[PDB]
Design a protein around this ligand. Sequence first.
Ligand SMILES: N[C@@H](Cc1ccccc1)C(=O)O
Ligand SMILES: N[C@@H](Cc1ccccc1)C(=O)O
Lengths: 100, 100
Amino acid sequence: GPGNKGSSKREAATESGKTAVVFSLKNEVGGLVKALRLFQEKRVNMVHIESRKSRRRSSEVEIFVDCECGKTEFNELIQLLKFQTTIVTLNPPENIWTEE
Amino acid sequence: GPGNKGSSKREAATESGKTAVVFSLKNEVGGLVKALRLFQEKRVNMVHIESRKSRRRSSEVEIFVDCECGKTEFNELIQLLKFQTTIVTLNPPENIWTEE
Ligand SMILES: N[C@@H](Cc1ccccc1)C(=O)O
Ligand SMILES: N[C@@H](Cc1ccccc1)C(=O)O
């Protein structure tokens, strides 16, 4: 039975998609690592990360995290992130582009 | 070697500048948080962060971290970062070039 062939195996996938969420936190040191460690807990790797800091004396800053993961996993992760801070923006900042 | 009790009431803002370093790590999940937690240890906040992922099947990825801190503190931090991975790129001056 086993050991016969199996040199190649195709895994099914539910198409492809991306997820992104804007997470806000205090401009404290290490605030970002606590936000990203949650992604590590769910074993979700990020593909892009960008932080924006305003000079309007804002105590809080917005950090954009882009990652690819299942929508269910994503929703669960977002719910955990929402615990730390209220997230009302779940859209990417396509308004601002970067040279990259 | 603990010092004596005292307080530094002398401060100077004569020295000012920015620091940046390119830190490379494996494309593992949570690799970035370990890199950034070191900044937290030195109480260094980052002002900009950007990660680059290639599709050339590179096991390692390069993450750019920009922060403002003392040069001495920065050098010490870099030395700690160098422990985790060899860093040969330290924000090179690609703006100018020479043909020596
Ligand atoms: N994929 C790695 C490195 C990385 C961080 C952020 C953006 C892109 C890549 C991680 O999740 O730690
Ligand atoms: N200043 C905060 C948030 C931040 C992260 C990265 C870039 C800019 C700001 C921190 O160091 O966690």
